[PDB]
């Protein structure tokens, strides 16, 4: 899960990390009166959406840019007007982008030096890791490419804890001279602990830096939380809005279902994630355009086949459906029945293609073909895909 920038700075602040002073706004007037209330040389007004890209993004008020700097409390106001209420699209959001309901009016700051520092669990390291380059400001993945030697790492020992020498070793590699160093390092230590404290898969700071006035500041930072640790991070997840989550996606979760939309017209739904990915793939391999990805887990249950279909009903981009269910733990006719029960009972009017596999598959297929419904039994996953595809040309 991800929180809004104003929520994660809050959080960083309460755990001793130094960030810019700031105010949150729901109206263009609160924003404007906030820039006056700050009282400073310059001001950063940043729309709040979880998708990165805000900088170069474009609003639907016509306004270009999700991030703006101005010393005049007024420019803030006029700019705000064009954000609250509108949608922001970025190189990272759906073509019509996310709606914006709050802006952040924080005090700009002089960035003397710009560095990159991030903390995560590394997939080859097992155990925390500090990743930082003295060349902050730019998109890490580019430094990594152009100058691999400006990327330092410090594996950390999950039992031991971060070592003073490591924070110093990093601070050093990051560019902090003499005095500043011991303050950099202590911020690093404070982040690492924040990181373990909150069950983050990642705490990224970019830029991490220094003001001319002598402070070590995380001017920007992204934080990814481990969705599995929610049961022990209720405070943090309480802040998760869900305002931004896609609708069908939201509904689907209520029923332990896991949905994700693609831009096609052939929906599908499978039991098991691996097989749901493979299903979207085989469709495409055969010329289709999968409409979504749906995983029911290993929890087949007449109830879900129903909500599962219910959902598909939503996306009116859908022209067909492929059901790939590998039974194993249950009789395939019970599944066929529930499929059809749910189908008439949901007055469907789109071609259905089912591929059931497991136990008692023959009678199960009989039910699907002897249903009167616009259903079609499929022999295997390839047959299933070929049909669904044919079914919409």
């Amino acid at each position: 899960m991800n929180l809004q920038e104003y929520q994660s700075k809050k959080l960083m602040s309460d755990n001793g990390v130094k960030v810019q002073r700031f105010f949150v706004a729901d109206t263009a007037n609160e924003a404007l009166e906030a820039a006056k209330r700050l009282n400073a040389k310059e001001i950063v007004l940043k729309a709040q959406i979880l998708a990165g890209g805000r900088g170069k993004g474009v609003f639907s008020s016509g306004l270009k840019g999700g991030v703006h700097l101005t010393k005049d409390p007024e420019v803030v106001g006029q700019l705000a007007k064009q954000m609250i209420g509108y949608n922001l699209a970025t190189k990272q959001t759906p073509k019509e982008g996310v709606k914006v309901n709050k802006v952040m009016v924080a005090e700009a700051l002089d960035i003397s030096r710009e560095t990159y520092l991030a903390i995560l669990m590394d997939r080859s390291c097992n155990g925390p890791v500090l990743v930082g380059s003295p060349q902050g400001g730019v998109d890490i993945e580019e430094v990594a490419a152009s100058n691999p030697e400006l990327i330092f790492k410090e594996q950390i020992d999950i039992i031991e804890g971060i070592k003073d020498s490591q924070a110093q070793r990093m601070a050093e590699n990051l560019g902090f001279l003499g005095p500043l160093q011991n303050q950099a390092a202590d911020q690093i230590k404070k982040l690492y602990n924040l990181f373990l404290k909150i069950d983050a898969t990642q705490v990224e700071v970019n830029p991490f830096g220094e003001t001319p006035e002598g402070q070590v500041v995380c001017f920007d930072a992204k934080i990814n939380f481990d969705d599995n640790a929610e049961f022990r991070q209720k405070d943090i997840f309480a802040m998760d809005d869900k305002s931004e989550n896609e609708p069908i996606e939201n509904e689907a979760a209520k029923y332990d279902l896991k949905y994700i939309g693609l831009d096609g017209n052939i929906a599908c739904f499978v039991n098991g994630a691996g097989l749901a990915m493979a299903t979207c793939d085989i469709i495409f391999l055969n010329g289709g355009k999968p409409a979504n990805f749906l995983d029911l887990g290993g929890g087949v249950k007449e109830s879900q086949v129903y909500q599962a279909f219910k959902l598909l009903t939503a996306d009116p981009k859908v022209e067909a459906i492929l059901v790939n269910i590998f039974g194993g733990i249950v009789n395939c006719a019970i599944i066929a029945n529930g499929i059809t029960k749910a189908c008439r009972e949901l007055e469907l009017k789109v071609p259905l293609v089912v591929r059931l596999e497991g136990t008692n598959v023959h009678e199960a297929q009989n039910i699907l073909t002897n249903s009167g419904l616009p259903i079609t039994s499929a022999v295997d996953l390839e047959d299933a895909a070929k049909k669904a595809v044919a079914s919409v040309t």
Binding site: Q92, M121, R123, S124, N126, G127, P128, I140, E141, D157, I158, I159, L196, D199, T201, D226, D227, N228, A229, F231, R232, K258, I260, L262, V270, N271, G272, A273, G274, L275, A276, M277, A278, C280, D281, I282, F284, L285, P290, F293, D295, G298, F326, G327, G328, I329, E357, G358, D380, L381, E382, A385
Partner: protein, 305 residues
């Protein structure tokens, strides 16, 4: 070393199992199914009731107990998310040979703390978490996989997913090939056993003549696999390796079901995984529907039928 416990993965008719989380609505269902199949399920832990009998079988309050008492050599866990990692450690404590954590949802931080330890002791070996388990068809089944779809045979199978594996197994038997040993290593990012761990076992198994490797987006386990095969499977007696990787159509930045199934920071995509294994001699099936027919042909070319 941890490396040195790989051998415990090869469960068989001699292996005796205890189910941590025995009276739970889950350990219940699978124990009736494990015994039916024909597995050496001796009992199960469940603090509190630690002295009664469940399913015509003994119950203990702890892992350490039930080990000694029943002699047992493998522990399977069905303990809910918040405690599941505790259970792994309670198993590594009593030095159990094989630990299979079925549980999905365990905090990733928990598992890094677990592997911290797990990579130090050599008595225990962990498969999981978030995995269907392991099966030596006909001899031993520890997990939630439908047994009747397996046929003892020649193909060693290793996968990060559950049902997709079932597809493969079904597809292999239908061409009559069968399996030697199947290991579902799970869909989580940090786990006790990876691909290479299993490939060593298959590469030195005489019973294993071919290998099917099922992967997906996220992480580098696939790329390490391709590396390992280049190094240990080239030359005059290499075994054929067939593979499918899911997620070619997955959008980036999203969690495709499994916690570890996510393309992040530009890393974890299928295309690069597929290109690496190919570079190591691995024939990669394009359709997941063709793993049986694909490895079948490989055997036929080498005239191994």
């Amino acid at each position: 070393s941890y490396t040195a416990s790989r051998k415990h993965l090869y469960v068989d008719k001699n292996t005796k199992v205890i189910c941590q989380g025995f009276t739970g609505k889950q350990g219940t269902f699978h124990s009736q199914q494990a015994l039916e199949y024909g597995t050496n399920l001796v009992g199960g832990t469940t603090p509190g009731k630690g002295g009664k009998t469940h399913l015509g079988l003994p119950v203990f309050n702890t892992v350490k107990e039930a080990k000694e008492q029943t002699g047992a050599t493998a522990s399977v866990i069905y303990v809910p998310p918040p405690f599941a990692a505790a259970a792994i450690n309670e198993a590594i404590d009593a030095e159990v040979p094989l630990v299979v954590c079925i549980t999905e949802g365990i905090p990733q931080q928990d598992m890094v703390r677990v592997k911290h330890r797990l990579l130090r002791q050599g008595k225990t070996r962990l498969i999981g978490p978030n995995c269907p388990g392991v099966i030596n068809p006909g001899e031993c089944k520890i997990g939630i996989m439908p047994g009747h779809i397996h046929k003892k045979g020649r193909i060693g199978i290793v996968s990060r997913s559950g049902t997709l594996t079932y597809e493969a197994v079904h597809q292999t038997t239908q061409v009559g090939l069968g399996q030697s040993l199947c290991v579902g290593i799970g869909g989580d990012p940090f786990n006790g056993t990876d691909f290479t761990d299993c490939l060593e076992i298959f590469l030195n198994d005489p019973a294993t003549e071919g290998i099917i490797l099922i992967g997906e987006i996220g992480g580098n386990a696939e790329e390490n696999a391709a590396e390992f095969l280049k190094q240990h499977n080239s030359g005059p007696k290499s075994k054929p390796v067939v593979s499918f990787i899911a997620g070619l159509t997955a959008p980036p930045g999203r969690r495709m079901g499994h916690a570890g199934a996510i393309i992040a920071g530009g890393k974890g995509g299928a295309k690069e995984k597929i290109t690496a294994l190919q570079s190591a001699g691995v024939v990669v099936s394009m359709s997941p529907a063709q793993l049986g027919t694909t490895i079948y042909k490989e055997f036929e070319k080498r005239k191994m039928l």
